[PDB]
């Protein structure tokens, strides 16, 4: 549910889209997520590794 469980009622959202809001919140246009989603996911999985 992203940040929304802080504010209230924990609105569900698909994770790929809330990450693209995280990108949009740091001035990187949200298409950068949806285009590079496999790379970003693979980078995250490697970093947890």
């Amino acid at each position: 549910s992203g940040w929304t469980f802080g504010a209230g009622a924990a609105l569900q959202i698909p994770f790929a889209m809330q990450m693209a809001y995280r990108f949009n919140g740091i001035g990187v246009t949200q298409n950068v997520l949806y285009e590079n989603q496999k790379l970003i996911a693979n980078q995250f999985n490697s970093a947890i590794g």
Binding site: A16, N31, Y34, E35, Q37, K38
Partner: peptide
């Protein structure tokens, strides 16, 4: 390139002017 994209028409507010 986009995962999970969907198909819909996107309206163009210029089109009815050129049409008219």
């Amino acid at each position: 390139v986009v995962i999970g994209i969907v198909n819909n028409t996107v309206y163009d507010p210029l089109q009815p002017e050129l049409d008219s």
